[PDB]
Design a protein around this ligand. Structure first.
Ligand SMILES: Nc1ncnc2c1ncn2[C@@H]1O[C@H](C[C@@H](N)CC[C@H](N)C(=O)O)[C@@H](O)[C@H]1O
Ligand SMILES: Nc1ncnc2c1ncn2[C@@H]1O[C@H](C[C@@H](N)CC[C@H](N)C(=O)O)[C@@H](O)[C@H]1O
Ligand SMILES: [Zn+2]
Ligand SMILES: [Zn+2]
Lengths: 387, 387
């Protein structure tokens, strides 16, 4: 119905509405461009790390765009295995591979349910898997983990951000077995819950799925994991499950890994100290992986400018990783600050860094009390020097 | 190699060792007789409840004994679907169906991996599934839940009792995401952990798998679940997840569902108050289902006498359901009781009932302090009337 270009790929896709959401359930959504850019960069990383030809899986392929961009824009793909349960998805996919002049022996197209596709007796494990569902990836996690080769990377998307972010808490509990927190850093809480779920499902088979990258945008989450083996590595991951206590009155927060250590009342203002989790309380970014993504992205003209800006922000963010973050406007509303300095400047007063999660958000190693003290010191010297 | 009879069935099986464990990994284990008796009784229950022909699944069939006994010893099986990934398992299974003169249109034999077998596009859901693995059932739970019809019953076995019972705690955590308790009621803790795992895996798909029967013997667990639909029912199940605090010094125990409520020290003796769970803190037995099993068992000559005795004990036990139980010998060792009355008599002093879990174990609604008080009152009137 319509021809579009993304990166080096050209594809035929049904016409899409004048405007779409980031998680729009259409055959091809151009707003997922950043997502696919990241997936391509993540694969190139593996190309450079393994230094050999890899086999990649695209179990939920639709137009075939991801598999195609993998083949066209990375150096090491021996063969791409694309799949979709939808028959017309398949037809379109076929024509799209041909449209990009991709040799037949470079790919396989299948029309199976994704779990069956992944669990086929291939005789080999996948080095790279991109799992890109509408909604939750939960139903496919185990099959992906089992199908992947040791040291392989998973490119993952989830669009069920509403439950994970606290809009629908009972729904979140049913699917992820965790209590969410609908606060100023709700998207981070959501991502950490998702990570926990991925890890525990793989852990059932003594597979260690280590998170190495996180990205939140509007109504989707983007994660990367690397698969490893050994019960000790699984154990290490599990040890980094925990909870976040958070106060809606004053925004105080605290990480708890010791079940004996929960506090009913917020030590700051005495309001109810809510509990979020259990969830991943470890790092959201592997420094080296993240740095590579950024550097490699900059060498590619076919990578969106936005992806490059986001990666630069995430690089900065990855150097001061914390559980949760602060939002300047909300702190300001709390202490009535005369004027809010631009976030780039604001973070400096807190020895912090910007976060991609929210425009005026920031991470810091300072304690909550210290942060509030800084909010008072500022405002105090703002008012004093105001004459 | 050898012909054996179990119930009404006659089967050919490889010769087995002079002696075997309850969980012996052989083609056919006669020590699982009680397990299979229960499975047959559970199916007849469904026969009487639905009053129509049912389709049953035996995804891990081996000799075919369960499917065969279902067909021969119950009234309502329209068709049995048996499966095993092992080729010689298949050969044997075929001959066994013929040996029992079962009409061809009454069964189907498949040689697939059990998850693929279960997830086949059958065009119908299974009314009854018997899942009988060596070790953990975890890898098959989701496929079973999805394949089952609403209102269908699951007959489940697990033989990985060592991790669940606290012998291997890190292994338990990896597979079940729970801390076990290697105490006097360790097998109950293990079962409640297993139940929790089953529920949460089904919950991922908004399926409510309600436990209705539990049985622990030596090195295996036997559970029954019924499948239901509706997020509210799933919610109800999740609400019955919780923890058990237990003291190894004095055997004090307490159920905690409120994360804020954990105590570091045992309120009785001040020793460390350990935490087990999260796990199922609800009922282990549906009264009606359990009663039926017992009554129906008594009408069947081909049902083991042992199964009948066990069911009678469980019937008694199901009328006073508690989280955890006490073991007389261990309490006695604690307070040095002159003589331990037979458990049948002992339970009366505690307003309790016997438990099938352990010979001299008992359940009671009395608090720990009350139990200990009874241990002191007894011993006191034992010594006073000793002259
Ligand atoms: N269970 C399933 N098995 C296989 N394919 C599925 C299944 N469920 C959904 N799909 C396909 O899943 C695809 C999901 C899409 N979000 C894929 C998007 C694609 N990766 C892109 O970047 O454009 C749809 O094309 C569905 O047809
Ligand atoms: N993944 C699998 N898919 C299908 N069959 C399997 C799988 N793993 C193990 N099996 C078969 O699982 C069976 C497990 C047995 N414990 C079955 C016992 C049988 N239910 C009985 O009562 O005698 C073995 O016969 C294996 O061949
Ligand atoms: Zn507060
Ligand atoms: Zn104690």
């Amino acid at each position: 119905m319509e021809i579009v270009q993304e990166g080096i790929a050209k594809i035929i896709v049904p016409e899409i509405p004048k405007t779409v959401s980031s998680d729009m359930p259409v055959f091809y959504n151009p707003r997922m461009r950043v997502n696919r850019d990241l997936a391509v960069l993540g694969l190139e990383y593996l190309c450079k790390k393994l230094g050999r030809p890899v086999k990649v899986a695209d179990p939920l392929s639709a137009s075939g765009i991801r598999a195609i961009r993998f083949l066209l824009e990375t150096s090491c793909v021996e063969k791409a295995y694309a799949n979709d349960i939808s028959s017309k998805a398949i037809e379109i996919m076929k024509e799209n591979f041909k449209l990009n002049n991709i040799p037949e022996d470079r790919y396989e197209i299948h029309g199976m349910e994704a779990n069956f596709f992944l669990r086929k007796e291939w005789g080999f494990g996948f080095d790279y898997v991109d799992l890109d569902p509408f909604g939750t990836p939960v139903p496919f996690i185990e099959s992906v983990a089992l199908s992947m080769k040791r040291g392989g990377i998973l490119s993952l998307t989830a669009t069920d951000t509403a439950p994970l972010s606290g809009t629908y808490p009972k729904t979140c509990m049913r699917r992820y077995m965790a209590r969410p927190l609908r606060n100023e850093f709700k998207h981070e809480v959501g991502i950490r819950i998702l990570i926990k779920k991925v890890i525990e499902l793989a852990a059932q088979y003594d597979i260690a799925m280590i998170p190495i990258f996180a990205y939140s945008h509007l109504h989707y989450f983007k994660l990367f994991f690397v698969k490893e083996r050994g019960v000790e590595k699984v154990d290490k991951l599990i040890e980094q499950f925990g909870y976040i206590q958070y106060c809606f009155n004053c925004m105080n927060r605290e990480v708890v890994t010791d079940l004996y250590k929960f506090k009913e009342k917020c030590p700051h203002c005495g309001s109810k100290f809510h509990i979020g989790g259990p969830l991943w309380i470890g790092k959201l970014w592997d420094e080296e992986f993240t740095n590579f993504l950024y550097e490699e992205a900059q060498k590619r003209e076919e990578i969106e400018k936005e992806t490059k800006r986001i990666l630069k922000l995430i690089k900065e963010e990855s150097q001061l990783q914390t559980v949760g973050f602060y939002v300047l406007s909300k702190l300001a509303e709390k202490v009535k600050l005369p004027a809010q300095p631009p976030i780039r400047i604001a973070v400096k007063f807190f020895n912090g860094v910007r976060t991609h999660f929210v425009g005026d958000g920031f991470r810091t190693n300072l304690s909550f009390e210290e942060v509030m003290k800084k909010m008072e010191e500022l405002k105090e010297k703002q008012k004093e020097f105001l004459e």
